[PDB]
């Protein structure tokens, strides 16, 4: 094998300089043999299993050698060493390049000038670079570009040696040894000769290879060329950093492949990180600044990251090139979904505008947040700066002092600062980015965990002391309290006792009580309830104080609720709207807490049932009161179910719970038909939850005691739930605004999920899912993921009934078509086309990897056939059966039947097919013939 | 034929490069914003198929209750 040099450079595990020296030794003796082996090395590096012979080298031209090597390539595939995956080939690329460079640099004082080695190598590489064989062109271009950068290093060494020789010549002249001056001039002449030869070789490779291969059809080759021209401009700036070499990067940063724009930006970075302040570079940047700024939004995120980083380096260079509009465009990217871009923009912003002491920095961040009409909250702004401005962001003492102590601060700015502070505290306690910015999940470093604990304790201390003050100051603003009340949920609660801080805990509870009895906003009450839940941890010594305050607040609220309902529901008094608002505020405060707390000791089922049954019997009951009473009764029932676990619960207690739930279900069924949309929605959601909790699965996990509590919905109730889904989830399209539509779509998606949970957990007949499955392509972009999870779980449950329900869906679509169009409908229309497309996508949900599929698919055909021949023509046997067209849909499933099953399906089709039909081959009968041919 | 890769066209002509300089509109895009509001962020967290099918339609702020619902899954 002539694979010596190739194999060595591939897996030699040997310093390239030793191999290069060995080759130069082979050269010194027999130059031609060494050069032939070098040629064959390049050829084999291109994956060529061919071999150039001595006779060829002697008597053949480059074109002929290339043609013969192409013919004798003897390839097994389209692969060549530079497109192979794996480390054993990336190392090959590295070794190839290192070898080229070391060869050149080691020949640079003698062999490089013999006018033999380099001309040969450059001719060969040029030829291979102008070949249509991609392996040859790719390889030869890489080789030639590495060779050129080595030549550049050589020419730079020569320029240095010439400067030093000129210095010595000047020195010796100043001395006046005339002989030594003449000798120095002769050395100057020799060095200029060498400079000229090196320039010739560099110009050769540049003109014969680069100017063509930088624009190669293959993007990878363009990338090679741009990477290396960047290297040249970086390493010999004095020679290669001019327009004559920068226009190439200018043009290529418009390439249509991100692989190439990336290399352009990285080359320009490498030129700007020198911080040598070039003027040629400044004018090039002036010319292509708009292009770079636009690339901050490149379709490839990597490219945008690098464009931002290049703009940062440009700032460092000079803050005079970029206009305000440019910098604002870069700022807007901190709110981007992709984190790399967001932190690049965050570094840009920090360096441009953010460069105790950290006071006015906070004011500037708040002004920026408010000037940014792109995000109403601050989680993502915070996360963008987390890397470059951790100090400023964790300086919570400065934030609290700004909010409390005392132009000053506005209300907008106080709200914004509260928001930013809450975000920083959340990302400090929680050591992960907000959703959509998190790069998966990982284990925190020891340092990260210690920082987590330190930050957690700082927060606990500071805000255990300050939050009562903040609450008091902004007790009346709803956003501010809603946010501030989320702070205790990150505390280390033990510090309340180990820190002698119970006084501030009492102050906080009192501020919370004042906020509750003073507010009605649902978010405020949500925060109050969840924070009270957070503080009442049974594994902390402060449990009893907070439990006492909680019980007192519940006592007050329940007393006021009973007293308000004693007058609101009096058959005489016709309540006003303000009496209703009072009752509603009390009920809201009660419900928010009954969700996250066990108020079974207050037996609020009575009041809520009375409210709901009054609403039913009278038909006039404010919506909000109705929905909150529904929620509160839901929570009462769930909490009682929670307390039933222990066998210490009485039998009469379980009977009480069962009857309460049984009547609550009828109440929710009554409200499901209400005229108010949101009331119907609330009833539906609570019904779906109750039906899941009380499904047979209630007794699954050794919970046999729970056998009597199982609740199965009526057929009427099943149909009512499905009808609500059909009327509310599946609505028209188009082809407020963004906010209203996304809100509505998320609400309806949760509804559909609530019903599909009942389906996939067999709480309702699987057949109902047909009405949903049929809506999979028409509502794909909205509900398709949910519908598809439903299909998957139903298949995994009972593939056979899944297929039966699928064919029922297609049958419903078919009956609906014939209803709207008619029994003489056109089979070339868009409706029938769409139905058979849905049938195709349905068919691809099978596969014989699971044997059961066979029977399943078989059933799908049986039923199918039975539906196509169900209703006959009013004329009789001489006219097609009404649902005959359905067969043309069923054929989309023949691609999943097996050779054995096709015959059985055919025999079952003969049970319905007659001879007079089998012969019929006119137009209207073509669906049957097609379905037959499929089998 | 041969599994060897042979490009028929090796270069992009000059006119297509002038075209690339004139119009890069197809290699840039709009700012893909992150959830702009708190609600939309919560919904991004809890609005997928897995979460939706593994959580109750009426949220339960106490695990003591949410377990009553999650019990009935498989």
């Amino acid at each position: 094998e002539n694979m010596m040099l190739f194999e060595v450079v591939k897996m030699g595990k040997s310093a390239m300089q030793s191999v290069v020296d060995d080759w130069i030794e082979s050269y010194k003796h027999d130059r031609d043999i060494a050069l032939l082996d070098l040629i064959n090395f390049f050829i084999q590096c291109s994956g060529c299993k061919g071999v150039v012979t001595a006779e060829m080298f002697r008597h053949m031209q480059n074109s002929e050698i290339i043609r013969k090597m192409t013919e004798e390539f003897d390839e097994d595939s389209g692969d060549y060493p530079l497109t192979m995956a794996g480390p054993q080939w990336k190392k090959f690329k590295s070794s190839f390049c290192e070898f080229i460079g070391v060869l050149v640099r080691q020949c640079q004082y003698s062999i490089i000038y013999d006018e033999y080695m380099m001309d040969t190598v450059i001719s060969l590489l040029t030829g291979l670079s102008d070949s249509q064989v991609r392996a040859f062109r790719h390889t030869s271009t890489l080789a030639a570009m590495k060779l050129m950068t080595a030549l550049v290093n050589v020419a730079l060494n020569l320029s240095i040696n010439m400067d030093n020789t000129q210095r010595q010549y000047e020195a010796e002249r100043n001395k006046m040894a005339n002989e030594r001056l003449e000798l120095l001039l002769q050395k100057r002449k020799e060095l200029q000769e060498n400079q000229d030869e090196i320039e010739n070789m560099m110009n050769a490779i540049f003109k014969g290879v680069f100017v063509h291969r930088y624009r190669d059809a293959i993007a990878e080759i363009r990338a090679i060329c741009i990477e290396e021209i960047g290297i040249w401009m970086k390493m010999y700036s004095d020679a290669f950093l001019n327009d004559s070499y920068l226009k190439y990067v200018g043009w290529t940063m418009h390439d249509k492949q991100g692989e190439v724009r990336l290399k352009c930006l990285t080359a320009l970075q490498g030129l700007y990180y020198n911080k040598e302040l070039n003027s040629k570079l400044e004018l090039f940047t002036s010319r292509f600044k708009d292009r770079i700024v636009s690339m901050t939004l490149d379709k490839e995120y990597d490219v945008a990251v690098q464009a931002i980083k290049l703009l940062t380096l440009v700032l460092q260079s000079s803050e005079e090139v970029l206009t305000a509009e440019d910098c604002e465009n870069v700022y807007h990217l901190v709110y981007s979904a992709h984190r790399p871009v967001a932190v690049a923009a965050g570094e840009f912003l920090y360096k441009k505008l953010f460069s105790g002491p950290n006071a006015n920095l906070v004011k500037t961040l708040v002004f920026f947040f408010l000037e940014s009409e792109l995000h109403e909250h601050a989680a993502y702004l915070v996360d963008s700066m987390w890397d470059c401005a951790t100090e400023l962001l964790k300086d919570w003492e400065c934030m609290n002092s700004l909010l409390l102590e005392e132009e000053a601060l506005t209300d907008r700015q106080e709200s914004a600062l509260i928001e930013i502070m809450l975000c920083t505290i959340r990302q400090a306690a929680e050591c992960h980015p907000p959703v959509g910015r998190g790069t998966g999940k990982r284990v925190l470093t020891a340092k990260e965990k210690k920082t987590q604990l330190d930050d957690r304790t700082k927060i606990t201390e500071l805000f255990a002391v300050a939050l009562p003050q903040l609450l008091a100051k902004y007790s009346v603003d709803a956003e501010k309290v809603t946010n501030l009340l989320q702070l205790p949920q990150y505390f280390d609660l033990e510090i309340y006792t180990t820190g002698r801080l119970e006084k501030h805990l009492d102050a906080l509870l009192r501020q919370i009580r004042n906020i509750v009895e003073k507010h009605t906003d649902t978010d405020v009450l949500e925060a109050c309830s969840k924070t009270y839940h957070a503080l009442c941890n049974e594994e902390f010594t402060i449990f009893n104080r907070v439990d006492i305050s909680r019980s007192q607040l519940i006592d007050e609220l329940a007393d006021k609720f009973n007293r308000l309902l004693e007058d609101f529901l009096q058959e005489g008094e016709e309540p006003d709207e303000d009496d209703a608002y009072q009752v509603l505020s009390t009920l809201k405060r009660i419900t928010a807490f009954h969700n996250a707390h066990d108020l079974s000791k207050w037996d609020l089922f009575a009041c809520n049932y009375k409210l709901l049954k009054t609403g039913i019997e009278n038909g006039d009951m404010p919506e909000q009161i109705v929905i909150h009473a529904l929620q509160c009764t839901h929570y009462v029932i769930l909490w009682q179910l929670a307390k039933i676990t222990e066998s210490s619960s009485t039998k009469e207690d379980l009977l009480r719970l069962k009857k309460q739930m049984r009547v609550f279900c009828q109440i929710c069924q009554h409200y499901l038909t209400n005229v108010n949309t949101t009331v119907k929605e609330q009833a539906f959601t609570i019904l779906c939850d109750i039906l899941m909790i009380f499904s047979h699965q209630i007794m699954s996990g050794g919970r046999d005691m729970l056998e009597p509590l199982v609740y199965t919905p009526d057929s009427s109730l099943q149909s009512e739930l499905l009808s609500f889904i059909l009327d509310h989830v599946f609505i028209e399209q188009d082809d407020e605004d963004e906010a209203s539509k996304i809100e509505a779509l998320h609400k309806r998606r949760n509804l559909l999920a609530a019903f599909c949970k009942l389906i996939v957990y067999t709480v309702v007949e699987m057949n109902t899912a047909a009405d949903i499955f049929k809506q999979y392509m028409k509502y794909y972009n909205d509900y398709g993921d949910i519908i598809k999870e439903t299909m998957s779980k139903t298949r995994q449950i009972d593939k056979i009934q899944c297929a039966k329900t699928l064919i029922l869906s297609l049958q419903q679509l078919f009956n609906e078509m014939i209803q709207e169009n008619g029994y003489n409908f056109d089979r070339s229309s868009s409706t029938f086309s769409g139905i058979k497309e849905l049938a195709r996508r349905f068919a691809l949900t099978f596969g014989l990897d699971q044997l059961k599929t066979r029977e399943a698919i078989a059933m799908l055909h049986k039923d199918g056939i039975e539906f196509a021949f169900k209703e006959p023509n009013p004329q009789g046997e001489s006219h097609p059966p009404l649902n005959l067209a359905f067969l043309d849909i069923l054929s989309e499933f023949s691609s999943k039947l097996l050779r054995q099953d096709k015959r059985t399906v055919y025999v079952y089709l003969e049970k319905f097919m007659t001879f007079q039909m089998s012969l019929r081959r006119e137009d209207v009968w073509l669906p049957l013939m097609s379905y037959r041919n499929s089998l | 034929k041969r599994k060897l890769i042979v490009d028929s066209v090796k270069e992009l002509d000059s006119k297509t490069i002038r075209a690339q300089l004139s119009d890069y509109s197809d290699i840039v895009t709009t700012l893909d914003l992150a959830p702009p509001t708190k609600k939309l962020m919560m919904w991004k967290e809890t609005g997928g198929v897995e979460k939706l099918f593994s959580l109750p339609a009426q949220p339960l702020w106490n695990n003591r209750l949410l377990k009553l619902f999650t019990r009935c899954l498989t």
């Binding site: 979904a337 779509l745 972009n781 398709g784 | 709009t30 914003l33 959830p35 702009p36 997928g48 198929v49």
Partner: peptide, 13 residues
């Protein structure tokens, strides 16, 4: 302009 892809479920195909 700027846009939020609110439909993080139609993302797939």
């Amino acid at each position: 302009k700027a846009v939020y892809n609110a439909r993080h479920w139609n993302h797939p195909d």
